[PDB]
Amino acid sequence: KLPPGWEKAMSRSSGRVYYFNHITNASQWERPSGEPARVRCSHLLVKHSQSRRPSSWRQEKITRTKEEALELINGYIQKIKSGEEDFESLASQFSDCSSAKARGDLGAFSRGQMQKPFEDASFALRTGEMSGPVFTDSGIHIILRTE
Numbered sequence: 001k002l003p004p005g006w007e008k009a010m011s012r013s014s015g016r017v018y019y020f021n022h023i024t025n026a027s028q029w030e031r032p033s034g035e036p037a038r039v040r041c042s043h044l045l046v047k048h049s050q051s052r053r054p055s056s057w058r059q060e061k062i063t064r065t066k067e068e069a070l071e072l073i074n075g076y077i078q079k080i081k082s083g084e085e086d087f088e089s090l091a092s093q094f095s096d097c098s099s100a101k102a103r104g105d106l107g108a109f110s111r112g113q114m115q116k117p118f119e120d121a122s123f124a125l126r127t128g129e130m131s132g133p134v135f136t137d138s139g140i141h142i143i144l145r146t147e
């Protein structure tokens with residue numbers, strides 16, 4: 001019926017159908033369009049107090065709650081989707097990963113190298129697509145598949 005991981009849902013506020021991906025946490029109104037050895041992705045990471053390493057180049061001691069980190073991620077996604085901000089600009093300013101210095105770019109990678117939820121979301125994205133919030137032991141990620 002639909003590409004890997006997609007399902008139909010109904011908007012609670014408007015009653016219109018939309019589509020949700022349970023691997024990437026992406027959601028969109030339009031029906032999703034019609035696997036490679038490697039993908040290339042960028043990401044924006046927001047760490048929280050239960051992150052494997054609660055520290056980053058932005059903050060020596062990361063104290064925000066996981067719920068707070070999700071609110072921040074959700075707000076970045078809103079501004080990317082509206083065009084008020086670019087993904088690369090937000091990643092450079094606010095990602096708790098040191099890849100922030102490369103506008104979030106991680107380069108190319110294969111299966112078995114990244115943390116599993118990150119890997120699964122990366123490979124389920126189509127080229128150019130963005131994930132919703134993706135949870136790993138590092139924190140919460142927004143993932144952009146660039147190749």
Ligand SMILES: OCc1cccc2c1OCC2
Pocket residue numbers: 097098099100101102104105106107
């Ligand atoms: O693009 C990859 C990259 C650039 C800069 C810093 C880091 C990176 O990955 C781990 C930390």
Ligand SMILES: OCc1cccc2c1OCC2
Pocket residue numbers: 106107
């Ligand atoms: O390339 C992946 C990577 C991992 C860790 C650190 C750095 C990296 O790239 C620039 C600095």
